[PDB]
Amino acid sequence: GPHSLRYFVTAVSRPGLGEPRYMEVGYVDDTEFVRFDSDAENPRYEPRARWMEQEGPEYWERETQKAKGNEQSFRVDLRTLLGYYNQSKGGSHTIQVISGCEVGSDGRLLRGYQQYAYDGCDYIALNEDLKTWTAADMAALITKHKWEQAGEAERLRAYLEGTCVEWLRRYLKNGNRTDSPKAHVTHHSRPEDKVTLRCWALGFYPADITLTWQLNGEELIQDMELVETRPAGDGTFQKWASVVVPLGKEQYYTCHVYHQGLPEPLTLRWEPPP
Amino acid sequence: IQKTPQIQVYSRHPPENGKPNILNCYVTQFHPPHIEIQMLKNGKKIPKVEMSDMSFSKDWSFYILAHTEFTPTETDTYACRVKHDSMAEPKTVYWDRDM
Amino acid sequence: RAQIFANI
């Protein structure tokens, strides 16, 4: 199926407290594989996926010096944006970028992209055509005009069609995992002709999962409570879904768990101890 | 433009009284990135809390996971307390062992 | 490999 290489960059000023903090984080198919964090005496690129130890010292040195140069560019940009928006030199501000390529299973580029934000709002984006920009406000129009006058789009297209695709192929080669959920139902009291049935999924990877409760062959959507899927902190994820049911009718409800690691969806009910 | 953190407090493994475990405070959907996270046992700050690296999502918002080693018991209360510029006062969320 | 960014 398709694959992607994306970098998520952050630059955050902290006036009067130090130099901006700069981070560059890389993802192959949405799994983090490298990170650079400027907050250090002699900051360096670090692997974040174990298979990255395959790259030799020259790789780490090159990526480190390039990140340091990127960091210094964003330090300038933070100052430039104060001028564009007529903002005080005293406040903290944040630039973020997501930049990368998505390729199909045939190795062709499906989409290259680069999106900037300033203080949490869209600022400028590269259009699908890889030739033009969409500015979000008047300040980003200044950037757009500058990048249009500088042949920036062609430089970026060369990166997205060339370097990005080529290294993505190398990383996929070097890095080529599911863990099925284990599920169970717990039982808890409610104002007390009612009981809460909570269906748990634990120990699964990747994070994508769907939990439903059924009564009389139909899914309960009204009043089903769900938590956002969350990290266990060991590389696996958790989720639960709960419903309030009448006391004594627990066996009329069924939890269904759907996940890519499973041969077929799980079906389960509350199992009162013997 | 600011985004208020969403917080979940929960154990890594189903909690069993007397059995060592890890208590997580997962904090998501916030902006700006600066945030101060503490965990609290019976109303008092826990000194050893670990912090994952911070990341951000496609919608620009940041997320981070705080955790501490703990051994639950029937009566001890745990909480996570988050101070962030989007809120006038720190937000406290208590651990519910059934969630 | 991350690109070299251009100043805004």
Author numbering:
A (entry chain A): 1 to 176, 181 to 278
B (entry chain B): 1 to 99
C (entry chain E): 1 to 8
Sentences from the paper on this structure:
We modified epitope S598 (S598Q600Y) such that it elicited a high-avidity CTL response and using the crystal structures of the H-2Kb/S598 and H-2Kb/S598Q600Y complexes, determined the basis of this enhanced immune response. As we have previously observed with other MHC/Cys-containing peptide complexes, complexes did not readily form unless the cysteine of the S598 peptide (RCQIFANI) was modified with L-α-aminobutyric acid (Aba, an isostereomer of cysteine).
In addition to main chain interactions across the length of the peptide, S598 is anchored to the MHC via the side chains of Gln-3, Phe-5 and Ile-8. In addition, the side chains of Phe-5 and Gln-3 pack against each other and between the aromatic rings of HC residues Tyr-159 and Phe-74, constraining the peptide's backbone conformation at those positions. Overall the S598 determinant displays greater complementarity for the antigen binding cleft of H-2Kb in its N-terminal region, with few stabilizing interactions observed between the HC and positions 6 and 7. In the wild type peptide structure, Glu-152 forms a salt bridge with Arg-155, the guanadinium group of which also forms a hydrogen bond with the main chain carbonyl group of the peptide's Ile-4. Importantly, Gln-3 diverges from the consensus H-2Kb-restricted ligand binding motif, in which a tyrosine is often present at position 3. Comparison of S598 to the consensus binding motif suggested a suboptimal interaction with the H-2Kb molecule at the secondary anchor position (Gln-3) and, consequently, an approach to enhance the immunogenicity of the determinant. One unexpected result was that S598 exhibited both low MHC class I and low TcR avidity.
